Design an enzyme around this catalytic site. Structure first.
Site, PDB file in Angstrom:
ATOM      1  N   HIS A 125       0.841  -1.183   0.000  1.00 35.03           N
ATOM      2  CA  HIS A 125       0.000   0.000   0.000  1.00 35.03           C
ATOM      3  C   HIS A 125       0.883   1.242   0.000  1.00 35.03           C
ATOM      4  CE1 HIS A 125      -2.790   2.926   1.443  1.00 35.03           C
ATOM      5  NE2 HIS A 125      -3.780   1.977   1.358  1.00 35.03           N
ATOM      6  N   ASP A 166       3.117  -3.258   8.406  1.00 35.41           N
ATOM      7  CA  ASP A 166       1.866  -2.578   8.097  1.00 35.41           C
ATOM      8  C   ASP A 166       0.668  -3.509   8.368  1.00 35.41           C
ATOM      9  OD1 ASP A 166      -0.339  -1.612   6.923  1.00 35.41           O
ATOM     10  OD2 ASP A 166       0.599  -0.951   5.093  1.00 35.41           O
ATOM     11  N   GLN A 169      -4.578  -4.345   7.448  1.00 39.51           N
ATOM     12  CA  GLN A 169      -5.495  -5.325   6.883  1.00 39.51           C
ATOM     13  C   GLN A 169      -5.502  -6.643   7.671  1.00 39.51           C
ATOM     14  OE1 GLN A 169      -7.746  -4.224   4.694  1.00 39.51           O
ATOM     15  NE2 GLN A 169      -8.802  -6.240   4.749  1.00 39.51           N
ATOM     16  N   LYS A 222     -10.819   0.477  10.130  1.00 45.69           N
ATOM     17  CA  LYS A 222     -10.923  -0.797   9.430  1.00 45.69           C
ATOM     18  C   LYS A 222     -11.429  -1.925  10.341  1.00 45.69           C
ATOM     19  CE  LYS A 222      -8.124   0.187   5.398  1.00 45.69           C
ATOM     20  NZ  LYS A 222      -6.900  -0.152   4.680  1.00 45.69           N
ATOM     21  N   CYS A 253      -4.655   2.170  -3.956  1.00 48.47           N
ATOM     22  CA  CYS A 253      -3.432   2.635  -3.310  1.00 48.47           C
ATOM     23  C   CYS A 253      -2.203   1.718  -3.493  1.00 48.47           C
ATOM     24  CB  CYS A 253      -3.718   2.717  -1.817  1.00 48.47           C
ATOM     25  SG  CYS A 253      -4.879   4.054  -1.477  1.00 48.47           S
TER      26      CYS A 253
END
Lengths: 411, 411
Positions: free
Chosen positions: A122, A199, A202, A225, A362
């Site tokens: 991303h 990261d 997700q 999220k 993204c």
């Protein structure tokens, strides 16, 4: 053990129609919806005990403080950090990663140092590194991907060298749905004397996180999220690294002494929290965590595995549809219809009440790697059902037929 | 024309008791309370149209976008900026000022350049400048204050020189309540070839702002102080300056093209908004603005003038109380009781249900200038009344008597 009717009854936003059809929200990878527990946590905050935090001089101020720092502790337990000092509240994953890039990368990179990312990242996990390397004269490297969009440990060992200071990678890709082998990459990074930056935007909403088991050096995630309020996220970092990092922002709340020219900082975590903090949002995130823990992340994870498998099978039943990524995946499917642009797909789907995403998601370098310009993408969460996936694949079938028909009508 | 009963009926949080006494909230300078219009704006967002913004591909996404950018326009009209491109949403005043210090100061300061602040500045408006000057080898200068804690234009002309690049000052001081002569300081700054940076955290909630009339180069403000959600603020900057500033943060949403090593940025304002933005909070801030505009900032300003005058008079009726700052002031009073520490004062006041603040109020240099260690502080807003100020001064009288009595009891 997880009842989906009971869970859906808690999300007011789901019970509505768009274009005369029942809403079918399949855009959780862009942003998730919120249950009453979260919205009413916000409500109770503003209705009953809003006040500035960290003064503890008056009743409401103490309640607000307890709620804010209580939520810090909920976050700490939720990702199994050792200490609250390693839990910083930020604006979101983006900001968290920028803080690491600003205060860690920019301060610890010399020409010939490498920072290593991957092609599937991303933008949040690309551009801060571009900028840190440009600022430092260091060099940016990309781990290649395999044909199914996963990552080989061999490629990792290839790319990260004794000059690598930072390895930054997604836990779960918002596009391919791959779950990267974070734990093994941490070991690899550390062998070459690098830190690893995860990261976790997700992964966090969808599966248990254990920073102690992952041995990540830093891990970023976003409230919006995972059933939490917008505007809030977390940066976790190993206490030892955060002690030697300078703040990314300066002002009230994060100082100890301020003279005319020079200032000293608070201890962690406050060293990294400049200004009146995201009081309500952080408390709501704590509520989101309570909610997800009461359902069970393993349960949610099982649900998404089930929906993802069902989706891949039903998509493979359609002609002229290409799905991207591996079989083993999180709860999302990125795809194209042969000959119809994904924007169009998404538009038509909205006319059936179906919310999906179309664009570069993204991940422009990953789009180029896939040899496509753009993609359509559907994502599932703890409130989604097989019936919804049926509606999606039926609508994709209808869309295919419709565009083919338009083609033949032209004479 | 402004009915205070009707206004108070809209703040649920006010109708409660602490320690068996009616709540008397006099801590609005730390954070303000929220009316139903704002809380229910948040509710409606999460209940009905939460989605990621800027995609406009599905119904909810379009509604969310309209709400977010609509709120940008509400902000623009509210401070009379020329363009939405000059309205950036941030986490708060602190972050806004840090963005200017990071992207403007750090990029435009050479050794021998001066940045000029004042002794009364909140930490938000001190430490970013300390850090920018240290990073650039420039030098930091302080405009002196007069005896009543106001600022003389003569001192300003004295301090800012042809080497001054940046003048940064509070519009309204959270401590002294002084309203600084921002408009004249802008003229002065510009004559020497400097930009002016206005910290508008304490002015914005309480009085009309006109950036065109103030001719400020940059102006920062915070939602939580003006009936808005926590976690959100604005940076206004002149389009021409923001065009030449690099972003403070990088990631999705603020790019146009992303290649492997290099990226281009969106146009303003998005150039400065990395990551999923503060969607709900910005929309609630728009609601806060609608609320305040419907009452009228001039009306609110008149109300606070009235309460401040009443407070100064009643405080002057107490022996052994020192009030700091000028006569002409915003709606707040900083003070000490002779011989009782302000922390104690605030504690006892809480036992009567009265919420005030005690400490350095994020202004350590100003505390030292006042020759004190710490202060007690009371602040008024659009929901406060004369009866509340009566309760405060009675409680201060009772506190004075109580501490004196404790003194004499010791044998």
């Amino acid at each position: 053990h997880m009842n989906i009717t009971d869970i859906r009854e808690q999300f007011p936003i789901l019970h509505q129609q768009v274009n005369g059809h029942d809403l079918v929200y399949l855009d959780s990878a862009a942003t998730s919806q919120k249950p009453r527990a979260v919205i009413e946590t916000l409500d109770k905050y503003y209705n009953q005990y809003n006040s500035n935090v960290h003064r503890g001089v008056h009743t409401l101020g103490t309640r607000a403080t307890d709620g804010y720092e209580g939520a810090r502790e909920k976050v700490r337990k939720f990702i199994n950090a050792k200490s609250m000092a390693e839990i910083i509240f930020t604006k979101g994953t983006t900001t968290s990663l920028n803080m690491v890039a600003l205060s860690y990368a920019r301060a610890n990179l010399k020409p010939g140092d490498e920072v290593v990312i991957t092609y599937m990242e991303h933008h949040a996990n690309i551009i801060p590194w571009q900028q840190a390397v440009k600022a430092t004269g260091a060099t940016l490297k990309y781990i290649p991907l395999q044909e199914d969009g996963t990552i080989s440990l061999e490629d990792v060992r290839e790319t990260v060298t004794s000059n690598t200071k930072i390895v930054a990678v997604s836990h779960v890709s918002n596009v391919l749905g791959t779950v990267n082998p974070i734990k093994e990459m941490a070991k690899i990074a550390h062998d070459n004397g690098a830190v690893i930056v995860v990261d976790g935007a997700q992964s966090t909403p969808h599966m248990k996180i254990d920073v102690q088991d992952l041995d990540c050096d830093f891990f970023a995630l976003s409230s919006h999220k995972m059933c939490g309020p917008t505007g809030v996220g977390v940066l976790y970092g190993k206490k030892a690294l955060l002690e030697n990092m300078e703040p990314a922002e300066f002002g009230g709340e994060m100082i100890d002494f301020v003279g005319l020219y020079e200032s000293t900082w608070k201890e962690l975590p406050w060293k990294f929290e400049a200004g009146t903090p995201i009081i309500a949002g952080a408390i709501g995130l704590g509520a989101a965590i309570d909610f997800l823990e009461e359902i069970g992340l393993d349960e949610i994870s099982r649900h998404e595995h089930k929906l993802a498998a069902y989706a891949l099978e039903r998509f493979r039943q359609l002609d002229g549809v290409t799905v991207y990524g591996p079989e083993e995946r999180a709860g999302l499917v990125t795809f194209n219809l042969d000959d119809v642009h994904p924007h169009d797909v998404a538009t038509v789907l909205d006319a059936e009440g179906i919310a999906v995403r179309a664009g570069h998601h993204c991940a422009q370098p990953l789009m180029k790697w896939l040899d496509v310009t753009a993609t359509a993408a559907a994502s599932f969460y703890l409130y989604n059902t097989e019936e919804e996936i049926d509606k999606l694949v039926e609508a994709l079938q209808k869309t295919k037929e419709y565009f083919t028909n338009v083609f033949v009508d032209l004479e």
